[PDB]
């Protein structure tokens, strides 16, 4: 039972990380599919250019929560790589705040929203760059939390 | 010791849908009628929620994608209830396209579509709340499938 609790501890860390991973996946989704779009009766989403303000307000709000989840994440083994993700998170949110002149208006252009939250866009000058590092810093954390769990369930057949 | 991990898969897949749903909550409760402010983060910007509504629709389509990929004979009736709940939600927003399919969506209209705790739920919020509980019902049943089999350790 000495490990029965350490396997449970390792898996709590994983679940918290996977939640952070999923919310980031939602920023990815709206950046790739909702920028320059409006709801449509039959097609689901139709073209509607250059009013991405409320959408980017949503991206900022999802990123507030990601930062909040990462600050609540605590584990001694993965301390360095939690804080690495945390600093990537705070760097992303601070970047969006910094470009408030282009992102803090109802009429956020399509091109500028892509530079903020579309991590695969050709230009990344308004947040997309920092967002990509956030994605990578979380998958370094996820790849490791999984190894922590795997190292414990391992201990039952050797 | 792998049906134990086979039902882990369905639990992790449901947890992901649950997290995607939590993001629609966040933007509904904190992004409607808001804009990016340098000092405050979010400040007031009323009645231009069309793009934020499009993101909510896109997250919802993704949710529907995830649930359609969930295959397990054990929870299949609860998965199908979740699937139908999702499709009914998405179809409601498109039904209300006249109010939500435009750039200048009013704050009131937006809260009536994606803020499940709003007093009036006429444009989607009602179906959203049922979507949440549908996934909750599935999450509990998934958390029973692994827990009853993980009981094999000490029973």
């Amino acid at each position: 039972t000495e490990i029965s609790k350490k396997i449970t501890d390792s898996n709590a860390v994983l679940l918290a990380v996977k939640e952070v991973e999923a919310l980031l996946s939602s920023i990815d989704e709206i950046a790739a599919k909702a920028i320059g779009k409006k709801i449509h009766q039959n097609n689901g989403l139709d073209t509607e250019n250059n009013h991405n303000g409320s959408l980017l307000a949503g991206a900022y709000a999802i990123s507030t929560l990601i930062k909040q989840k990462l600050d609540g994440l605590k584990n001694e083994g993965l301390k360095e790589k939690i804080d690495a993700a945390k600093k990537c998170s705070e760097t992303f949110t601070n970047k969006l705040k910094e470009k408030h002149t282009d992102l803090g208006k109802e009429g956020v252009t399509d091109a500028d929203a892509k530079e903020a939250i579309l991590k695969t866009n050709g230009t990344k000058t308004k947040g997309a760059e920092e967002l990509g590092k956030l994605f990578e810093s979380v998958e370094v954390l996820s790849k490791a939390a999984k190894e922590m769990l795997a190292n414990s369930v391992k201990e039952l057949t050797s | 010791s792998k049906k134990i991990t086979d039902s882990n898969a369905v639990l992790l897949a449901v947890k992901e849908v649950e997290a995607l749903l939590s993001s629609i909550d966040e933007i509904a409760a904190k992004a409607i009628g808001k804009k990016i402010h340098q000092n405050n983060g979010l400040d007031t910007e009323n009645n231009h929620n069309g793009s934020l509504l499009a993101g909510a629709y896109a997250i919802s389509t993704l949710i529907k994608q995830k649930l359609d990929g969930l295959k397990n004979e054990g929870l299949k009736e609860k998965i199908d209830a979740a699937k139908k709940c999702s499709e009914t939600f998405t179809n409601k927003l498109k039904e209300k396209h006249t109010d939500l399919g435009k750039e200048g969506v009013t704050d009131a209209d937006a809260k009536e579509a994606i803020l499940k705790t709003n007093g009036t739920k006429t444009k989607g919020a009602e179906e959203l709340g049922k979507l949440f509980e549908s996934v909750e019902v599935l999450s509990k049943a998934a958390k029973e499938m692994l827990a009853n089999s993980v009981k094999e350790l000490t029973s």
Partner: antibody, heavy 116, light 108 residues
């Protein structure tokens, strides 16, 4: 929407023990918790603790344990607050709260009077 | 933990005038703030949740504002039904601590 209904009013004397209940119905609490609140006469609202509606694990403020005990019956969605060796300062209205989304659901309160 | 301080302690405001109370958290709480009105001898009534959204049955003359650590509730034109003690609450994780309250009397 979530509805919370609590026990009837209670009158005890110093030394006895009381148990209150709070039954939840409607949607699930999005964070799977029920929080207890105490309001002594003339004082504000004070947070006491919370219980995990999945595990039954209690968590309390330092002001409230070694004495207060919190349990939950999952089948009936019913939280329980039991206080032992009651003292005059336990006289308060005790509320039971919880959230769906960011909306907090309340009421109606249980009134406890510890007195001779 | 994150303490919540309310201000002012009390106000006496006439009908038709405006009212603003302040809630300040000791750390950033991410707009996870509720506002309550409580009349003497009744349970508190939720007015605002997640910092800005009105609760059920709450009139449009109420509003919530603020971010980070500073938040406020405003009544732009005060009606005589609005006397009471007003409380803020941090609503996230645990604990869900309360402000000290603000007693609002209607001047007359």
């Amino acid at each position: 929407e979530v509805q919370l209904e609590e026990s009837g009013p209670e009158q005890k004397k110093p030394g006895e023990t009381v148990m209150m209940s709070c039954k939840a119905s409607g949607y699930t609490f999005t964070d799977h918790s029920m929080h207890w609140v105490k309001q002594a006469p003339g004082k504000g609202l004070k947070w006491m603790g919370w219980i995990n509606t999945e595990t039954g694990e209690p968590t309390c403020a330092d002001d409230f344990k070694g004495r207060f005990a919190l349990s939950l019956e999952t089948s009936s969605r019913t939280a329980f607050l039991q206080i032992n060796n009651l003292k005059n300062e336990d006289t308060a209205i005790y509320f039971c709260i919880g959230r769906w989304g960011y909306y907090v659901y309340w009421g109606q309160g249980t009134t406890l009077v510890v007195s001779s | 933990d994150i303490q919540m301080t309310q201000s002012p302690a009390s106000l006496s405001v006439s009908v038709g005038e405006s009212v603003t109370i302040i809630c300040r958290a000791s750390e950033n709480i991410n707009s996870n703030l509720a506002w309550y009105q409580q009349k003497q001898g009744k349970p508190p009534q939720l007015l605002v949740y997640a910092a800005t959204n009105l609760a059920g049955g709450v009139p449009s003359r109420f509003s919530g504002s603020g971010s980070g650590t500073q938040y406020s509730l405003k009544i732009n034109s005060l009606q005589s039904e609005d006397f009471g003690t007003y409380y803020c609450q941090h609503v996230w994780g645990s604990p869900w601590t309360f402000g000290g309250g603000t007693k609002l009397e209607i001047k007359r």
